[PDB]
Design a protein around this nucleic acid. Structure first.
Ligand SMILES: Nc1ncnc2c1ncn2[C@@H]1O[C@H](COP(=O)(O)O)[C@@H](O)[C@H]1O
Ligand SMILES: Nc1ncnc2c1ncn2[C@@H]1O[C@H](COP(=O)(O)O)[C@@H](O)[C@H]1O
Ligand SMILES: N[C@@H](CCCC[NH3+])C(=O)O
Ligand SMILES: N[C@@H](CCCC[NH3+])C(=O)O
Ligand SMILES: [Mg+2]
Ligand SMILES: [Mg+2]
Ligand code: NA
Ligand code: NA
Lengths: 541, 21, 507, 21
RNA sequence: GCCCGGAUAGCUCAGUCGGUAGAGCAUCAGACUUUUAAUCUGAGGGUCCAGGGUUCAAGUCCCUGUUCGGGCGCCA
């Protein structure tokens, strides 16, 4: 092979040689697999069980009662009780095996989030020899089914005294002890099943997320909202700045672009004659990943005809307050943005949220008088904004446009104070298209953003139903995006036609499910609420 | 401001009595 | 006249309205009552009364502008699928010059708001005599003719908003689809299941037999395959400890687009622990029959597989569904005896199947493997007589690489398929929890993929590693919720039950 | 034969009597 | 893209100034018929993230990657 190999290889070789030499010189100075290879030993034991007729994978086990119902029903037993006239069948995973004797063993069946003891005594078993056989077969982590009578140990521990234990599914890997558990983030994310097995709060987090999604659906349906399914791929890239997920279709011999937002289809449906629509689904944005961003994410978006953002500002209040009260049981939650050892914030979700106007509050905070709302589009405003950003030690990467500088100032000043849920309303028209202009104050739009714990969770604005202005903004977007080529594919010509056919005054709303889940589960990472976060594979040999 | 009331499509008061087997 | 000329003239008129301070896009119009509630509450009126003490505000799209002189104009407002009449009279209107002004700017298709008093005409038609009509959103395009509404299938599918505006049954179809999904969710929630969400981008595609979509992740230089089935993640979750899980979601397939197949389609997959396919066979009966009874109002439905002018088939959804076996019924139909089920992974059985397909004129493009030949034979002989819902169970393991082996019959699996109207809607089996047999099956699929049969399932190390941690005896079930909508809404086309179906681009 | 009863996660006693706007 | 860190037995973690990596748990064998994180006796283990180098000698030092925890960005 390699001449003189590598000093390393050479080095590695000797140690081995030294290792085996010392090993033989020691053991013989005085085939069994080493105990650390639990997988091989367990696999060979299972294979031997298969060959001699004791197949460890039964097709069907009839469960009479769940563990939670068992605990609820038989928690009233006194110590030493034994209901010899009641027979029940339960099932679960073994988490402990305390052998107090040759004929008395204790198992800890953990399932459904609860624990039930199993005190196996050969005196109560059907016979001694099968008791020994089954207790020799069983290991920790094995899924087993237990048929027996309820009882309570002299200590006062509820348990099921088994008449017959059947192995349902053996475990071929070492199962970590619950006292240390699983604490490595990479291991927890790569093996979510092990995370659920060893950690109990993960199951509660996902139950909470499911409860969140159910509540929203129920509320909207009672209001009279219809659930819809819009396409997830389109043949048009669109004019959005967010980078899409490209895909190829061999039959159409073309590329298909993943959905960024279902807004256009919802508005077309409202044009069709469905006044109130909603959809909870996935959005795919080919962008960066951090604690509060994921490339694919679940959002709930609804559209309501004959409404403005003022009505949405009350509907959102009712939604959020009712959901928090229904799930957490109160209006005040505790959030740890930095972790269980960092500072804890008390977030109050009382019905009437705080409402602030961006321009006035920014003037109050920044300390000076920004230009009038009609003069933001002038380069003078851009210049004075740049001067203020430099003076206030705020950094904005280029380009230093008015929209980006204003967003940076808002994030730096108006956003460190949004601990409790707060509405920020009346954005400048430049920072936001697709929102109807403000009916009273010129130069502002008709949107609002709900911020909880300095993070945006909701986003709603009066939909622009003017075909001419919408077409102008779409063409400006396409001009900026295309940089040559043809805007033909950066302009939706069917949405414009629908708008020309006529859209009623509508209000659109959209909420991030994941972020709400993190806020209601005390999780500072979005991956804590995703069941299977995307992890690049670990190179292996 | 309370939006006009439209009646829920998917019936209401638990219209579907799903027959759990 | 010319639609282009109409559009140009209406655009000019609306621009003139804008520059004159008569904004045709008001920010807010406070609607007080819905059209359905208006019809329900004031249908008791006598033919000719006029309740002048009640003033309500409604809104909707004008469907007809009939003129009966210079002082009386009838409008046909259409809202939530109902009809209302607006008899604008100069006397009741706020002002005469304003009556003329508003009547010279409104045309059919416009979204308008009407504030007025309920009443009835001498002909006994419920109406709202307006006190003030407000134009909310003009319609710049000429709507199709009243007697020549949208009938071209391509136009209806490409422009769904026009279909909703002109055709009323489309709204009912989509309401029924929503009802189907809500009923499924309620059934599974009351059973004790937990709704989950599984990744739509998978490093390795798996869970079904299909051609995947390939995308490129930006933060992750690795490419990602779109979801074809959430099966391998549901099983991992059941390994985790959640005994009953379910998910209604979108699956993607890179196959051809036709009148029955779409690139993205909605399916429901629930997974039960400590269950077998014999329990799912009862649960599916209960839930399908209950859904049909709850939506249609009865157990018997009528389906037209080739349009309303074709033959009508009466499908009965009595809770108990017929049950048949693939091998036995296939032998009975073929009038012969197939080789023993324990010799199905061999070559002579493949030769026998090929000879039978050739003799019976069954068509199967290459590769002519045993699984594909069996599928073609079953489709040609078994599913063509399953009008009423029927269970076809005990499939060979060559046709199911993720189903557990049958208890008593060798070479078969513990699975079943629900066939209604000669089409499959459901697919369920007892999950395979043995890591060694699952690895052997995965290995066999790779052999095939290597030489042709690219549709063969891919290999996954993570799923096998999870199986090595102990998967309880479980049963999985999956229903394609597009065909259920087609059968319940009486539509022989997937595009009918899809809001925006994928269409071939037009020149 | 009907599978053992598992309590619904989402209350199960029609807890979602939502207070609507 | 840029910056700052981490990677040691299945799990939870030590390892000094380079001189043969070692604790608890888990696993293996054996006791003990009321234990709960059982206890007691005895035993084995890791390419210390992977590759290359410096050194008489590398977990320990230098240099490549790999995969990750964060912070900037990006998501108008
Ligand atoms: N990359 C992302 N990852 C996760 N959630 C997001 C992401 N982008 C936006 N959201 C959330 O989704 C909501 C609606 O999305 P948007 O239409 O972008 O405003 C926002 O208010 C956020 O809470
Ligand atoms: N291209 C497709 N478009 C729509 N539905 C499909 C498509 N491919 C498969 N299905 C559905 O999926 C089932 C058949 O494939 P499978 O899910 O593998 O059993 C049926 O319920 C079909 O309706
Ligand atoms: N994608 C939109 C949905 C809500 C507003 C509807 N136009 C957003 O969150 O900004
Ligand atoms: N995922 C399968 C059905 C699931 C059956 C139980 N695992 C399919 O789409 O065909
Ligand atoms: Mg590094
Ligand atoms: Mg021992
Ligand atoms: Na470790
Ligand atoms: Na040791």
């Amino acid at each position: 092979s390699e001449p003189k190999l590598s000093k390393n290889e050479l080095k590695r070789r000797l140690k081995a040689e030294k290792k085996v030499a010392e090993k033989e010189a020691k053991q013989k100075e005085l085939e069994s697999v080493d105990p650390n290879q639990y997988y091989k030993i367990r696999s060979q034991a299972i294979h031997q069980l298969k060959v001699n007729g004791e197949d460890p994978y039964p097709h069907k086990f009839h469960v009479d009662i769940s563990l939670t119902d068992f605990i609820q029903k038989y928690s009233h037993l006194q110590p030493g009780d034994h209901l010899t006239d009641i027979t029940l069948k339960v099932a679960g995973r073994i988490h402990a095996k305390r052998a107090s004797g040759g004929k008395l063993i204790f198992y800890d069946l953990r399932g459904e989030g609860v624990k039930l003891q199993v005190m196996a005594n050969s005196r109560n078993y059907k016979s001694e020899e099968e008791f020994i056989h089954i207790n020799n077969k069983l290991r920790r982590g094995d899924i087993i089914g237990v048929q027996g009578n309820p009882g309570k140990t002299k200590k006062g521990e509820l348990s099921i005294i088994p008449y017959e234990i059947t192995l349902l599914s053996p475990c071929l890997h070492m199962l970590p002890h619950l006292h240390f558990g699983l604490k490595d983030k990479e291991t927890r994310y790569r093996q979510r099943y092990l995370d659920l097995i060893l950690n109990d709060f993960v199951r509660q987090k996902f139950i909470i997320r499911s409860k969140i999604i159910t509540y929203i659906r129920s509320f909207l349906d009672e209001l009279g909202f219809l659930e819809i399914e819009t396409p997830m791929m389109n043949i048009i890239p669109g004019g959005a700045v967010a980078k899409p997920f490209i895909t190829y279709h061999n039959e159409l011999d073309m590329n298909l672009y993943m959905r960024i937002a279902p807004e256009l289809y919802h508005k077309m449906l409202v044009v069709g004659g469905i006044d109130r629509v909603y959809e909870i689904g996935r959005q795919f944005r080919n962008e960066g990943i951090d604690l509060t961003h994921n490339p694919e994410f679940t959002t709930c978006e609804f559209y309501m005809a004959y409404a403005d953002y003022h009505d949405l500002m009350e509907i959102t209040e009712k939604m959020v307050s009712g959901m928090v009260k229904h799930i957490t049981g109160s209006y005040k939650v505790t959030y740890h943005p930095d972790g269980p050892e960092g500072q804890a914030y008390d977030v109050d979700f009382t019905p009437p949220f705080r409402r602030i106007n961006m321009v006035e509050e920014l003037e109050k905070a920044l300390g000076m008088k920004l230009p009038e709302t009609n003069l933001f589009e002038t380069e003078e405003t851009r210049k004075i904004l740049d001067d203020i950003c430099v003076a206030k030690a705020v950094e904005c990467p280029p380009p230093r446009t008015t929209a980006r500088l204003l967003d940076k100032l808002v994030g730096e000043f108006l956003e460190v104070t949004c601990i409790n849920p707060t509405f920020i309303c009346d954005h400048p028209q430049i920072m936001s298209p697709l929102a109807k202009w403000h009916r009273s104050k010129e130069g502002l739009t008709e949107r609002f953003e709900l911020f909880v714990m300095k993070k945006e969770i909701c986003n709603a604005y009066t939909e622009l139903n003017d075909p001419m202005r919408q077409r102008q903004l779409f063409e400006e977007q396409a001009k900026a995006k295309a940089a040559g080529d043809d805007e033909a594919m950066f302009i939706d010509e069917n949405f414009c036609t629908a708008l020309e056919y006529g859209l009623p005054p509508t209000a659109g709303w959209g909420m991030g499910i994941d972020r709400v889940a993190m806020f209601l589960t005390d999780s500072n990472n979005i991956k804590e609420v995703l069941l299977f976060p995307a992890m690049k594979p670990e190179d292996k040999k | 401001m309370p939006m006009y009331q439209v009646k829920p499509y998917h019936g209401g008061g638990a219209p579907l009595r799903v027959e759990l087997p």
